[PDB]
From Swiss-Prot:
Gene designation: DCLRE1A
Induction annotation: During mitosis. The mRNA encoding this protein contains an internal ribosome entry site (IRES) in its 5'-UTR. This 5'-UTR generally suppresses translation while specifically promoting expression during mitosis, when cap-dependent translation may be impaired.
Source organism phylogeny: Eukaryota, Metazoa, Chordata, Craniata, Vertebrata
Annotated source species: Homo sapiens
Subcellular location field: Nucleus
Phenotypic consequence of D139N: Impaired nuclear focus formation, reduced interaction with PIAS and increased sensitivity to cisplatin
Described function: May be required for DNA interstrand cross-link repair. Also required for checkpoint mediated cell cycle arrest in early prophase in response to mitotic spindle poisons. Possesses beta-lactamase activity, catalyzing the hydrolysis of penicillin G and nitrocefin. Exhibits no activity towards other beta-lactam antibiotic classes including cephalosporins (cefotaxime) and carbapenems (imipenem).
Included range, full protein: 700 to 1040 of 1040
Tissue spec: Expressed in brain, heart, kidney, liver, pancreas, placenta and skeletal muscle.
Protein name (database record): DNA cross-link repair 1A protein
Superkingdom, taxonomy of origin: Eukaryota
Family membership: Belongs to the DNA repair metallo-beta-lactamase (DRMBL) family.
């Protein structure tokens, strides 16, 4: 049974609710982004309308084999009518194709569902600025003050300088980058670019990247492993065993691996600046954990919410425990009293 926080009242609409069989009354299923927790349940056998971005539609067609007739892609930043209700899709600053959705209810209520997002001050000059929002369905992943991390720019700067230094000292070193879903592509694209290489990967990953409308992508990626000195691997293989094994396969082309594991937040953030980060090393293999987030920090979320001044907030993440729910409601009240809405 679909929980309440995936339902849009006064509509036949749901958001990110494909794992419940047929939903009573739902004439249109929205998908915010192509991450597995959110699409869970979609397959080539699905027979109801799906509304999403163009990029999310490319991935549903080609990766999940949903049939074309059920895929309804919408342009961003454009007022659209769906089943007699005005909607707008906005960029979520999450992974490729990720959107927020604005619903203008027939009775005058305005609802924003963020899906997954990383809040940014640039969102204060979208179509959100134009009018008032009564309900906010909020990505609350990191809704606690201890969740700090740097900008995506500072993290990319670190990674580029790290890779460039190591490979300039040793031209026989190989760089490896972990992945398990779309998002965070900038990590491996920026590293390959400073190294003058294409990024090499499996056929299944190349296919996924081919759906994302990245400009000049054919210049940046390849399935020919041997010609490239930046390789992508599944995240689970980014360990001393998995990397040794991969190094055997390259056939004495390389004598060193430097690898990157993009995580979300980890507690090493509570004590250590990005500049100061060090790897775990075993022999000729070094692994860096780098905190590249595609979710709001506490401060970025607080800022967005105090700017938006919603009348009511419904969290969509960390909703399973009483202590979580209670903690989140406390921060919402502080924020409200500090800004005075
Ligand atoms: Ni996500």
């Amino acid at each position: 049974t679909c929980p309440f926080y995936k339902k849009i009242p006064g509509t036949g609409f749901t958001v990110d609710a494909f794992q419940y069989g047929v939903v009573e009354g739902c004439t249109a299923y929205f998908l915010t982004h192509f991450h597995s927790d959110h699409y869970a349940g979609l397959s080539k056998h699905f027979t109801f309308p799906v509304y999403c971005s163009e990029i999310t539609g490319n991935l549903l067609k080609n990766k999940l084999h949903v049939q074309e007739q059920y895929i309804h892609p919408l342009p961003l930043d454009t007022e659209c009518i769906v089943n007699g209700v005005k909607v707008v899709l906005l960029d979520a600053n999450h992974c490729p194709g990720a959107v927020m959705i604005l619903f203008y209810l027939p009775n005058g209520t305005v609802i924003l569902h963020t899906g997954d997002f990383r809040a940014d001050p640039s969102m204060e000059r979208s179509l959100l600025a134009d009018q008032k929002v009564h309900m906010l369905y909020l990505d609350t992943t990191y809704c606690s003050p201890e969740y700090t991390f740097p900008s995506q720019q500072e993290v990319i700067r670190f990674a580029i300088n790290t890779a460039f230094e190591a490979v300039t000292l040793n031209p026989h070193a190989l760089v490896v980058c972990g992945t398990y879903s779309i998002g965070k592509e900038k990590v491996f694209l920026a590293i390959a670019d400073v190294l003058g290489s294409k990024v090499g990967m499996s056929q299944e990953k190349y296919k996924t990247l081919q759906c994302l409308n990245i400009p000049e992508i054919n210049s940046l990626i390849t399935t020919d492993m041997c010609s490239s000195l930046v390789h992508l691997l599944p995240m689970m293989q980014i360990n001393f065993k998995g990397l040794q094994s991969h190094l055997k396969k390259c056939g004495g082309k390389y004598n060193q691996i430097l690898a990157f594991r993009p995580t979300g937040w980890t507690h090493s953030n509570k004590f250590t600046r990005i500049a100061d980060v060090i790897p775990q090393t075993k022999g000729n293999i070094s692994i860096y954990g780098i905190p590249y987030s595609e979710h709001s920090s506490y401060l970025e979320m607080k800022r967005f919410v105090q700017w938006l001044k919603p009348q009511k907030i419904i969290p969509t993440v960390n909703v399973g425990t009483w202590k979580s729910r209670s903690t989140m409601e406390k921060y919402f009240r502080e924020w409200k009293l500090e800004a005075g809405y």
